[model samples]
Target: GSGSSQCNAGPVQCCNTLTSASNSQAAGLIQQLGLSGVGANVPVGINCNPITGIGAGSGSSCNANPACCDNVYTNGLGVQCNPINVNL
Candidate 1:
């Protein structure tokens, strides 16, 4: 990336990219960042259902969700809107 480095897959959906970082380098940098469960704001139509009960894994259970990306997981960062990336 030119301005800021990013580790993304597929075609360059975004812009200002230099080249794809090696799996090791990309994963290493991302790990060092240690900044998960963080983002600007939820995009349009990315609904997040309410979390209920005690000791629940995800705020919105993915057992019977309409969307495929609705699955929630626990990574010690709290019930964030996004998933945690332990490593690569």
Candidate 2:
């Protein structure tokens, strides 16, 4: 799935908490990143990668999966994946 136990075994996860016009803000972000079509399909939010600079990294450095760490991850809209307790 996400590719690792760190990604799967999570007490925390990234979330896209944005809303309303902010959805546009999220869409803009996705476009800015050059991943135009990805946001529409994938859960949008911030990507939690050390290289990109969103949140803390997990045991391993950021790769491209939220299962790795408990960071806030999204590409544009709101969120594709988040914590157990979080709600869109």
Off-target runs (Cα >4 Å) in candidate 1 are 1-22, 35-88
Query: For model 2, where is the 10-residue window of minimal lDDT?
Result: 79-88
Q: Report, for every candidate in turn, its global Cα lDDT versus the true structure.
A: 0.24, 0.37
Q: On a 0 to 1 TM-score scale, where does candidate 1 land against the true structure?
A: 0.18
- Cα lDDT of model 2 by residue, 10-68, tens digit: 32333334222235655566556554444344544453332233334544223333322
What's the CA RMSD for each of the models? 17.0, 8.6
Off by over 4 Å in 2: 1-22, 39-41, 46-79, 86-88
| Number of clashes found in candidate 2 | 9
Q: Residue 66: error of model 1 in Å?
A: 38
